[PDB]
Design a protein around this nucleic acid. Sequence first.
RNA 1: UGAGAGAGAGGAAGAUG
DNA 2: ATCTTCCTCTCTCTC
Lengths: 452, 390
Amino acid sequence: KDTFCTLPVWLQQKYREIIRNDLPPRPAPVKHDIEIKPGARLPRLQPYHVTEKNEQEINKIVQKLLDNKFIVPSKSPCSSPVVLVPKKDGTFRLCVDYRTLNKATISDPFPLPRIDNLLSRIGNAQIFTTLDLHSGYHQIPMEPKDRYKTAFVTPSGKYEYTVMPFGLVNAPSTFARYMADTFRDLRFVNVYLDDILIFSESPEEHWKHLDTVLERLKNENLIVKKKKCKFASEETEFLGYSIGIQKIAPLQHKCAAIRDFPTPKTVKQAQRFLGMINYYRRFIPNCSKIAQPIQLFICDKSQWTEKQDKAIDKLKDALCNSPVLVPFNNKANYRLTTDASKDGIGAVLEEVDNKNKLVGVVGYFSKSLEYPAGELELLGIIKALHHFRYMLHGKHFTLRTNHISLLSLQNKNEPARRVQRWLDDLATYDFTLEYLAGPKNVVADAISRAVY
Amino acid sequence: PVWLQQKYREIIRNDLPPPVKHDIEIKPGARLPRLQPYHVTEKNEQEINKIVQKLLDNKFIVPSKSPCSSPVVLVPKTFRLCVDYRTLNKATISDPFPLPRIDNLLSRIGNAQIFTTLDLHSGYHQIPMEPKDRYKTAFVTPSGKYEYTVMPFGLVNAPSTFARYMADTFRDLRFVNVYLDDILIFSESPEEHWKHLDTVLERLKNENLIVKKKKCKFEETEFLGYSIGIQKIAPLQHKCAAIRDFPTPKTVKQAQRFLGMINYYRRFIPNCSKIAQPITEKQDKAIDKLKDAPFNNKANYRLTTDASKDGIGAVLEEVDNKNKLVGVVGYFSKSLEYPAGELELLGIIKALHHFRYMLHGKHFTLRTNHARRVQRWLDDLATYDFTLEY
RNA sequence: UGAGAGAGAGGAAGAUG
DNA sequence: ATCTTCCTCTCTCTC
């Protein structure tokens, strides 16, 4: 876990200045702009009431930013409030609650290729290197014209951003459009939304490759957040896929969740499994007659022999194939459904017609969890959305959840404390919340309640 | 006060001896006001003319033929002058700056002992005007037209201009509360108050801002309409002697005009909102009941919140190293709006929400007894750490 | 005439079941 | 049944 030393000394020395671990103060391309919805009002919000110590800590950060030239003071005619986020580290984070802004701003998502068309490029590559720029946050200039829109307000101040803060609605497209612009003409570099992938077929050619990409970054006055990068290694991770020499295969397959879904022991476990299948009973040739061996065990008394074992695996196979599964498309209307709990999270992304109703599923999600459970469950939900990052990109969807912290985003006012730390990442998804209570959470629950 | 007297006598000096400048930016589409003056009586015009000279006297305004023309207002109390700038303002870009929260200043004082007070001499009038934008302040009196050379009260961004400036100069002194032109400073030891007084007087001297020495006090002051005592905060007798001696409500407004003034002092009146339930032979027992009627960061507290119907009650008290009481820092009460347990929970979260800017998060204790909107209630409750009581 | 703060009385329109 | 967002008005306070 020290892969920079792994690359030649002449490269180490050439780009030492731009492969840093902390952002130096601003040195001054394409910019981030904020186009407002015709007839929308920019926010004119007061700051949130915080305690003495907290505001001290708020001011500590404003200084660090002022000193970094990321913000200058404003006399802006609008303002958004601010939430201090107490990292797990003892440190602190200033998050600007740009929800009211984001509502009033147009979205211009940058069109990205299918991931599988990108992975097709790596071909017979032998070394890979990934570079992190943290999506160009705090680097990409705000458009001078649009800076006042970013204006935050603390209990005793009013500053505006000069570079691209977190929390703004079209951020990752800006960085995406940027990377396309600088790197689209190199057949050895894959770029998408986050990392830059560099692939070559020999470490010989690789250094000449890195030389070009790092130069181009250096000419953009960009900085590579070293600590995140992986340099010239055999294996690397990219776009949720595991990138190998000749082996590309996802970290969590489309159907892993239902495949490794454990065989039931308790009655309840079976009832939950059956309850899930029942939800998509429509997309399957007579599920009522093939769930019989199971349902009978649940119902009255019968042994869980290999006669249930067959029935289960027949129903699993039914969920992992058409017509339960639908070959995703770009113009589709998605809807994500998450239930998290003790121990684990499960979620389901499903297509929906012009009438809000099932056409099928696009992927299931499952993940185990390591305090309190209120905080831990939300992490689960974030990890589910994260999983579906590249598919939900550009799309408006509907997120169903029964997490009272996340649900507080329905109201315009100051959000619940337990959701505030995820305000910045949430802002990059374009979702409508919807409350969830069974039997609509039957799929998600079975996946959730049963971790593997 | 030996050395300080030497150092800042130059700025602690009545009358203003001859940088931040106020700006007035007009929204692109907008046109400036060319308004005709307000009607005035023969004896009002005299009171106007006596002030227009006083303004001309200290060289705050100059007679100038700007194209712009806003009308003037004569305010009773003595009689101050205010220009109606409402048409001007609607043509100027806004500029919202925070003003210190009052609940928030009273809560900072801690167990500070000796408080000095500074009064910025002639308020906004110590803030020059940017000459380019001077002509916009132009106003027609019946006599002739004038122009403010110095920041007049009653422009949109006027409080923000001064509130910024103050915030920037005094944001990082944990012993100084500066609310616009009023500046409190609170210390523990007299020794420590000297070093403190120097520091703020430096900054006031560094900006060539002037204190009106006559108008300020250097072990007990008054501030923001309150009276901050040594180990106490209590409402002053200035506003208390117009509260008992306020005529019993007979009219509709008077019923509101009474709840309205006793409002700002809700902090002191226990079960306040619950005793105004009538506000009619039962209105009388109520206006008389209310007429009758200390936060240190490091200390422990007890939030008590018994709440049934007809109200939700709560008081927060300072408690001994062991237990029981030390004092009271406020009483909270609200009207509404379903089972007591949930009714007593709403009482808790609306109470916690009230003192959140002190209680979140110290380890205090809760004295109290013992579905979606309750999930929410329960979630808010979770972010506080405490321990329930019988 | 200005900026915020508190308490209170009402009104109009939506969304998901 | 849940839950949003927008507006008018009354009384008061701080400077």
